């Protein structure tokens, strides 16, 4: 009859702050991420289609004029089952369309974090060959993989609403280290074969 309330993780819980940078050859910005809600996909029911994470981005001094730019983001957690590493095997619900990418994109981006074994990689398998009979469940592995996408502009981090050009088209591949709290990310834009790099630690 009843459904699980889920769990919160030491480094994936409401109220948690991270700080760091987003950078690339021509970009460097100080950024802060705050986790607002968590609904980990521990099982498959209706709630597992709702966002698994919601939070805010804050960019410091985006323009010479704007000292604080704040966006609201939503995201989903890889659990290798209903939400495998290959986004194209995600459920067919339309609200997940903004998180899709080609198989090779997902594959290369997940690999680039550098925490997978060297063995058994296949572009045609729903977890790219990285989740097997002897793998631990996602919450019990050291590294957790997520996809984040911003979808609203806000005024302050207290969250009132005030994003549709090309500079908003992609999404973040995200990797959390549960042992140290460090967070790495790649902002991927479909139409450009370069990314931006997100690096955060807990505040």
């Amino acid at each position: 009859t009843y459904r699980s309330l889920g769990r919160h993780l030491d480094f994936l819980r409401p109220g948690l702050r991270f700080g760091g940078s987003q950078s690339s050859k021509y970009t460097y910005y100080t950024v802060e991420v705050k986790i607002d809600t968590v609904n980990l996909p521990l099982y498959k029911d209706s709630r597992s289609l709702d966002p698994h994470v919601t939070g805010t981005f804050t960019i410091k001094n985006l323009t010479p004029v704007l000292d604080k730019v704040v966006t609201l983001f939503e995201g989903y957690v890889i659990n290798y089952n209903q939400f495998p590493l290959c986004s194209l095997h995600w459920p067919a619900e339309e609200t997940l369309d903004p998180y899709m990418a080609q198989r090779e994109s997902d594959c290369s981006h997940w690999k680039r974090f550098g925490h997978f074994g060297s063995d058994n990689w296949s572009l045609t398998e729903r977890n790219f060959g990285q989740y097997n009979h002897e793998s631990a469940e996602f919450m019990n592995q050291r590294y957790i993989y997520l996809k984040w996408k911003e979808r609203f502009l806000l005024d302050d981090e207290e969250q009132e609403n005030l994003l549709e050009g090309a500079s908003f088209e992609g999404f973040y591949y995200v990797c959390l280290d549960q042992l140290t709290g460090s967070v790495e990310g790649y902002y991927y834009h479909p139409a450009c074969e370069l990314f931006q790099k997100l690096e955060l630690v807990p505040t």
Binding site: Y26, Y29, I59, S167, G170
Partner: peptide, 8 residues
């Protein structure tokens, strides 16, 4: 999101 090339 895709941030400006503030070092360009």
């Amino acid at each position: 999101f895709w941030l400006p090339a503030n070092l360009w």
